[PDB]
Design a protein around this nucleic acid. Sequence first.
DNA 1: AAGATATCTT
DNA 2: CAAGATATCT
Lengths: 236, 241
Amino acid sequence: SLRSDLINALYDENQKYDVCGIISAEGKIYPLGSDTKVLSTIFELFSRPIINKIAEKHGYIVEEPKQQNHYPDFTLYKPSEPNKKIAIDIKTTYTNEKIKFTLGGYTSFIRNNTKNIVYPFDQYIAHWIIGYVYTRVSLKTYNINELNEIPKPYKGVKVFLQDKWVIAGDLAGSGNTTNIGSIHAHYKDFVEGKGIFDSEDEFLDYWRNYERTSQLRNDKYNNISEYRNWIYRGRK
Amino acid sequence: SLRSDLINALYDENQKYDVCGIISAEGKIYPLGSDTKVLSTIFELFSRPIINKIAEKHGYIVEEPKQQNHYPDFTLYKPSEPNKKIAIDIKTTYTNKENEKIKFTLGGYTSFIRNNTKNIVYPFDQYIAHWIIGYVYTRVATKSSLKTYNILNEIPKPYKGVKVFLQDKWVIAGDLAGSGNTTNIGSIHAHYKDFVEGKGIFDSEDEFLDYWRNYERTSQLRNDKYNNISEYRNWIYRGRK
DNA sequence: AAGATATCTT
DNA sequence: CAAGATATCT
Ligand SMILES: [Mg+2]
Ligand SMILES: [Mg+2]
Ligand SMILES: [Mg+2]
Ligand SMILES: [Mg+2]
């Protein structure tokens, strides 16, 4: 399927290549830093070609945001089927071990159908995440003839594709920027989809009603159990 | 000066090289993106080798942060002058059309500026200078960009024309916040020449620091204290009340 | 759990 | 402009 083919192309591209630097039109190469801000950008760009390839093999157009305050990285849909859009978002985190990802905000497009999203939320039937996990490890320039001398910015990189709701946790991934937090698990759990939410419906209701701070949460719910109890009390 | 040498090299390299892609160890090339998240990453990496070259030429060591929530991008210092550290930070923004007004977010006003060792590589008072290497690029619509290339000139560049300046943070500082929830100092909102020339709003670097160290976090609160330079000077005139 | 890391948008 | 968004980190 589109999914199987994409996850397949993603494992392959990852196993075959290693980004090691930025190159100029004149052949001079600058080394990559070993931090998420750099790697996230690089992992996304490394994914682009592969996502566009498979999307076309399946007849899906690929649209990236035109504006910078918008989720998702890539919007795939068939022209004949505009309300069957697929959201594919790239996320990165590192290990020195269990990982965690910040999964987007909980007060934007999930609480407002047209907020910070390329197309209205209700037009997407799936929300996938391509998660890159890298083990964290030059101030000079190099040329084409020196590609193997350039230090790589990672000890190894793994990638997985998984549905957002499936890997979502019940604890916020960030405070002031109110992001849904993923599960805090070993990469295995992400590939396998060993989440805590019973369904995508449950995941959504939870994050749509999660209070921004502990003050408010301490009288509603702070975790999955309290939420399920909150539901039993009649959503109050 | 290190400063004159630095700006000349940044300026020269800017006018003679154009980054166009990420290359792999195998030689595969992935085209770049056109948004700021990508470009600020590119611009910083492009800057690094120059900053390091010029620094060494003046006997300065260059240190980059160790943890990810630390300012600045590059801390320069001579062993002989440990309390004379120079903070060199790289900022980037874009413009939809060449020669438009621009603005930068100049770091938070509630971390190191209010607390000597909070979110900074070295204690705030060990730096005598805080420079901003500012990059401005004209956005270009993203297509050849979607495929890989073999070994350059054929690859579409995600920008029309990069501009670079070097200037003291206090000099280009404005009086309005650069961000809300992340409490950043905002720069002046003006043309590029204005940043190069230092046409800012504060009189001294101490006025810069006092203003931002006492700027309240919301319009609500600011309304009773001060929301712009004018208001702050009146507030200063009355005895800080 | 809350607020830092840089910058953009309405 | 205010404020809250865009991604992660500590
Ligand atoms: Mg993107
Ligand atoms: Mg992403
Ligand atoms: Mg840096
Ligand atoms: Mg920077």
